[PDB]
Amino acid sequence: TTFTTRDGTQIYYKDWGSGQPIVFSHGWPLNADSWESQMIFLAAQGYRVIAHDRRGHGRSSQPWSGNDMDTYADDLAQLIEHLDLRDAVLFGFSTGGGEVARYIGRHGTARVAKAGLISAVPPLMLKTEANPGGLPMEVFDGIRQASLADRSQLYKDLASGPFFGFNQPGAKSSAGMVDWFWLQGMAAGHKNAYDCIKAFSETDFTEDLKKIDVPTLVVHGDADQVVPIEASGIASAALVKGSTLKIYSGAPHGLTDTHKDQLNADLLAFIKG
Numbered sequence: 001t002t003f004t005t006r007d008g009t010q011i012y013y014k015d016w017g018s019g020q021p022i023v024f025s026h027g028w029p030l031n032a033d034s035w036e037s038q039m040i041f042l043a044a045q046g047y048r049v050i051a052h053d054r055r056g057h058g059r060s061s062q063p064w065s066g067n068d069m070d071t072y073a074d075d076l077a078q079l080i081e082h083l084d085l086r087d088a089v090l091f092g093f094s095t096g097g098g099e100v101a102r103y104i105g106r107h108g109t110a111r112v113a114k115a116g117l118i119s120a121v122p123p124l125m126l127k128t129e130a131n132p133g134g135l136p137m138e139v140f141d142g143i144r145q146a147s148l149a150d151r152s153q154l155y156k157d158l159a160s161g162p163f164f165g166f167n168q169p170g171a172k173s174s175a176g177m178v179d180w181f182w183l184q185g186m187a188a189g190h191k192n193a194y195d196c197i198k199a200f201s202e203t204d205f206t207e208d209l210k211k212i213d214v215p216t217l218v219v220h221g222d223a224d225q226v227v228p229i230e231a232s233g234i235a236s237a238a239l240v241k242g243s244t245l246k247i248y249s250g251a252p253h254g255l256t257d258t259h260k261d262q263l264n265a266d267l268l269a270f271i272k273g
Contacts, residue, residue, distance in 0.1 A: 024038065
């Protein structure tokens, strides 16, 4: 399904099932397809599952401009308002956890019953004087540089090495997970995926997280090589009042796929809470 925002951007979204709405916000450089296993599970359990493609990702249009978290957040706000959702549970994975946080910081929680930050970027990835445990800018520069040189290879390298922990001792890649990650990545616009690197790594969601006044689940692997857990999941859980954190021992960043049934069960229990 498609909806057009006030600025003319066409957002593609999926909407399956009936019951309380659960909105999923995907990671970079993926699209709504990456959430399909949590969506099929939860819709079968009696919920309505909604997942949109961020601007410039998947099937949404690919604007040259507005590839930043304020806009991501405002596009999500317009989708929620368009569907007139009430009592929604917003789940964001990685960059999409930043999207959810910024949506709440800019728009509040009148339409939100609960939120979840899964392997998510908040509060702030970048190493700064206030965030000394973050990652150095050179890391993100490296990702922009590989994006411009050969993004199709970058995606294959990310999925083959850090993203699913296939580079860990005793582990080996599997082609279905590498190529599906690559495939979604190639549907995104090059400009949109490129500009998103700064938006997921430099945006500081600290103030957004202090405005979250609804039950919040934080899920993070402690072997996440892409979004280091101390400066993300642990730090989010500390900032969000009343949040619950589940640390998956030894789990990598893409735990939606490597710890699928575990995550499915944790999301359902959280919703029923």
